[PDB]
């Protein structure tokens, strides 16, 4: 489950 990053 690949990380989801919003920066």
């Amino acid at each position, epitope marked *: *489950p690949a*990380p*989801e*990053l*919003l*920066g």
Partner: antibody
Amino acid sequence: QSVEESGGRLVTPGTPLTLTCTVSGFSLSSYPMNWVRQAPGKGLEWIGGIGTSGNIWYASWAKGRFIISRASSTTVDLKVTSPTTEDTATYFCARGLYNDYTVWGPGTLVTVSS
Amino acid sequence: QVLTQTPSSVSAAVGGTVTINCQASQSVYNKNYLAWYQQKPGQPPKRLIYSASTLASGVSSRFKGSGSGTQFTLTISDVQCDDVATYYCLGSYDCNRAECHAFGGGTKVVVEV
């Protein structure tokens, strides 16, 4: 590359209000986009954002109070579903938030009062 | 995740040093996804530092970020009058596991002459 917020105004509590973030000089779908607010004299608070995935995320506290969407090829909106006096704040949008492409708008002021 | 900054206010001498602490209730992504922001009245926040210790392009080397996991520090050296501002830490996380972002509550910096 820049972003600019619009739609900030005086609204009576309970009246739906939509703010818009307009992007210039980049593709909205190629970067994360975020909404952040700041009540007068108070701290920055992350509301939510859109990943490059297209997934739309909210802060715990913002759930049920705000809806974010890709409104056009060049805009992301933030709808405040039922504003209260505690939603009085400047609302910022940003491309990113920590990476080197991060850029913020000047903010748009929402005043919730009768 | 909730981030707590201490102190909430600093009054420091020009040419001195200020230390601002940030504690995260849970470990940030990769142990280092913690950014620092500077904001002046009526202006958008300006990114100073990302990944705990990486200075953002255009920023003065007087700003230094340190720490890891849940405990982080911003140090402003050779404090200048134009450092008067509020400073915020920003913790970021895998959205699949935690709040994507959380800001600290801010630390106001004022200078003494």
